[PDB]
Amino acid sequence: EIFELKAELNSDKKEKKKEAVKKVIASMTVGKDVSALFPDVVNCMQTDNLELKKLVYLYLMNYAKSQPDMAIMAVNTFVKDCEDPNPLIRALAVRTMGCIRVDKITEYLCEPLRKCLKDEDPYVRKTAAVCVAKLHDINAQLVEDQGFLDTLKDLISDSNPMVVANAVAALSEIAESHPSSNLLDLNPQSINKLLTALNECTEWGQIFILDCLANYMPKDDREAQSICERVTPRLSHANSAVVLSAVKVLMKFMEMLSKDLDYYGTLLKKLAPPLVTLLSAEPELQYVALRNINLIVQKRPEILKHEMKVFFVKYNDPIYVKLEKLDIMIRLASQANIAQVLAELREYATEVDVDFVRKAVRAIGRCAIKVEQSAERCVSTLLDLIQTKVNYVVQEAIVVIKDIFRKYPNKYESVIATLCENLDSLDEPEARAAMIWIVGEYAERIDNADELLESFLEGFHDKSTQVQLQLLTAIVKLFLKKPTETQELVQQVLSLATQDSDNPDLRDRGYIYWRLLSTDPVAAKEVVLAEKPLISEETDLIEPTLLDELICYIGTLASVYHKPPSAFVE
């Protein structure tokens, strides 16, 4: 096996050497540790056939860190191959030289990189630009000593738009890891030159050309207006990433644009069709598009204000897209499309996904809380869902009703009677506690509040700490409001939570309630059953400092996760 392969590779026949190289390549792909034969394949490296040279280069690149000592026998071969007349051979040699993670090999590769930096072949120029960035990433000090920054800068101002885009991408990658010292920023002339080659760059070069402008900050409206005018044609690109990059560039440039002029309105109008088109992309990019819309929605919510029909989740939409659709609808939810949002949420509550049902219930509750004009509709939908006889739906409706009552309980007395008998046997801690709190705070429209709390007091000492605290609070509120029918109930609750209750917080609360009852029951009405102030709803909008930074990071990992770039990288 190994001996036969070595003998075949150490032969003078090309037909056997090619077969041995193919077998070695297949073994590595099949998951075979062929790094022990790296020195044997080194001899059969300088071959005229290009088919075997690529395999040898790939094996050396994949077997370079494993055997760095044995890789010292390839510098001469790389130097010889870096001057071949064929551009493909030179490009392959340049790519292989930068792909080898050898500390003692990149030092001697500076001369070939410098020679290929000014290569006339555009493919050779791109290969040299890629190798320069690879060497800088491997060794920034070596790249700085070699003076490749000056050569890289001159690449953008030369011909070959693909090579120019590659050089710009390499410079951006080098500056990305750089400490911001000696930045590669350029004046308006460089931006204009890059824009002139933007229309001639390829699909991949467009991203590189538009990423450079993401770091530059315009200082005048005329420059910003020109940048917006030049980036406007990018919104009609077939590439999904190109459209997203153009949208991010336009959003970044809009920070310096003036809303008084008509340029801002034209940019806003020309961006909605791009978002609509991006929303119909592949399912893999659907999550990215939703994240981008959410990030830009909190900054410029006046662009996609009328885009609500396209936010409806499809039947075949993925879970990651279906979940984002509810968030997008909630963010764009308003009184104009309140009925449409309610209808969509009602249809989403008849599915079979428990997570999807919970997300739909949460979105409906958020829409009801945010817009007070649809509070009655949200309450009716929650009542219908509770009457639907669904355990998860019942818990979600109970949670939504509990949340709504604390926010809008002035006219919530018409639903207490319906919720008085709504299958209270559910053991969900998030639903039982909410029901207990609603009964305690709304113990006026229910004539059997004391009777209902009797069933929940059977296991109050072993139900839960939050559940026990809620039950104690409800009992105290009922005693303060109606102490005739709950005189013994309050004493029983105090005895159970103060004598047989070992919870520290629960025991302290019970002791405080007992002291308040025994000190001044009249004062308990103004102390315990007092009018609480308006509850501050948790705003879902991001901080303005993070939103401004997230605007520049569009289409990256920091945008999908909605986290800062330094809080997720390692």
Binding site: D121, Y123, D355
Partner: protein, 415 residues
């Protein structure tokens, strides 16, 4: 900013891997399978994974997942675009995308992966251009990649100059259970198979509403395309200036423009279905299909899928026109109609049994989707006006185009 582009399989084995930066260890792919399994079993599975400080963002292919590991804050959109380009290149080179070609085309697959992207930054993605430098059966790279025109190889000569267009319509209707349509959008698709000699600069001209308004003829039938996405060959500046669609068509079949505008007209096919499902006794499907399209157009291969019960057995179909068959694999009744003339009305009366024992868990109500496809019918009314084929040598082109109307996301919500 992908660190290592690798191709997985259905059993978790990496069919092929190609590191581009080397900043991510090759052993992190082993944890991708357990992470994906955990995400799927908890409902948190996403196309982009996260193995500690390394994110595994990839899409799901026919048989393998093209997961591309990354460590820095790389562009997720860029990674997705690179994966899509790689999938398209594989489809162009290999007619099948499965494990049968991964283990048999490694010699050319490795070369294509190396040439496609270097250091995580893709440089060449054109299948036609890439086929002239990397073949499985090597000369200098073509000047098309180095030149600005990277989508039309120079020197192409043909006996005749015939370009075939395909105006494919996508009728997508989102009809709620109440009977109203919520999402009713039609997305155009102008796919042309250009086969000419040289590098002609096609000048596409249609009856666009914006163009008609600019020229002053905004009174006839004009297509109001809300969103127009031109191809790479189409010049964005020319379209932005005066709605001039001028571009060099490629050699082969490609998508030139993809219009997408909302539709406010009645649906071409109206389905009135009823569900008289008895409580564990039987079920009735009074489904009636009404064709609202023009009578001159025939919806060939009309297939209105009616979702029947999953556990239904011994079903009977009482229809009028078209064969009705129930497929237990899909758990739905396929109302297949060969020829559906416009204005026709097909009535069906389904009748299937149900087991006495109730189901343990709910199965949901999948929407009913129709598969109507009426050729020679443009719902949007957009008609091609001219196609300026200009060549330096000078030749008489013979452009051609056909209009096809089909159904896209034309689903009907059930009760």
């Amino acid at each position: 900013s992908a660190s290592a582009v690798y191709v997985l399989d259905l059993k978790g084995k990496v069919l092929i891997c190609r590191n581009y930066r080397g900043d991510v260890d090759m052993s992190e792919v082993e944890h991708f399978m357990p992470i994906l399994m955990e995400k799927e079993e908890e409902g948190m599975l996403s196309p982009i994974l996260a193995h500690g400080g390394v994110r595994f963002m990839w899409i799901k292919h026919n048989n393998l997942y093209l997961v591309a590991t990354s460590k820095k804050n790389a562009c997720v959109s860029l990674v997705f675009s690179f994966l899509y380009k790689v999938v398209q290149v594989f489809s162009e080179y290999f007619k099948e995308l499965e494990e049968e070609s991964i283990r048999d085309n490694f010699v050319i697959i490795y070369e294509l992966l190396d040439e496609l992207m270097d250091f995580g930054y893709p440089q060449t993605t054109d299948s036609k251009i890439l086929q002239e430098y990397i073949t499985q059966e090597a000369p200098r790279p073509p000047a098309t990649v180095t030149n600005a025109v990277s989508w039309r190889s120079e020197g192409i000569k043909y006996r005749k100059n015939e370009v075939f267009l395909d105006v494919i319509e996508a009728v997508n209707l989102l009809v709620s259970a109440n009977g109203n349509v919520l999402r009713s959008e039609i997305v155009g698709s102008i796919k042309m198979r250009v086969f000419l000699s040289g590098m002609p600069e096609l000048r596409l001209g249609l009856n666009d509403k914006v163009l008609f308004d600019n020229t002053g003829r905004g009174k006839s039938k004009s297509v109001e395309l809300e969103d127009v996405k031109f191809h790479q060959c189409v010049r964005l500046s020319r379209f932005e200036n005066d709605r001039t669609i001028s571009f060099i068509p490629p050699d082969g079949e490609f998508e030139l423009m993809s219009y997408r505008l909302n539709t406010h007209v009645k649906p071409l096919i109206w389905i009135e279905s009823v569900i008289e499902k008895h409580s564990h006794s039987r079920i009735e499907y009074m489904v009636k299909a009404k064709s609202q399209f023009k009578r001159r157009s025939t919806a060939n291969n009309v297939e209105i899928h009616i979702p029947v019960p999953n556990d239904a057995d011994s079903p009977k179909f009482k229809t009028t026109v078209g064969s009705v068959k129930w497929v237990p694999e899909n758990s739905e009744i396929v109302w297949s109609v060969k020829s559906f003339p416009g204005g026709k009305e097909y009535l069906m009366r389904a009748h299937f049994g149900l087991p006495s024992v109730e189901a343990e868990d709910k199965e949901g109500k999948p929407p009913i989707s129709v598969k109507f496809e009426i050729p020679y019918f443009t719902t949007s009314g957009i008609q091609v006006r001219y196609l300026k084929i200009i060549e330096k040598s000078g030749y008489q082109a013979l452009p051609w185009v056909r209009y096809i109307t089909q159904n896209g996301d034309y689903q009907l919500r059930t009760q």
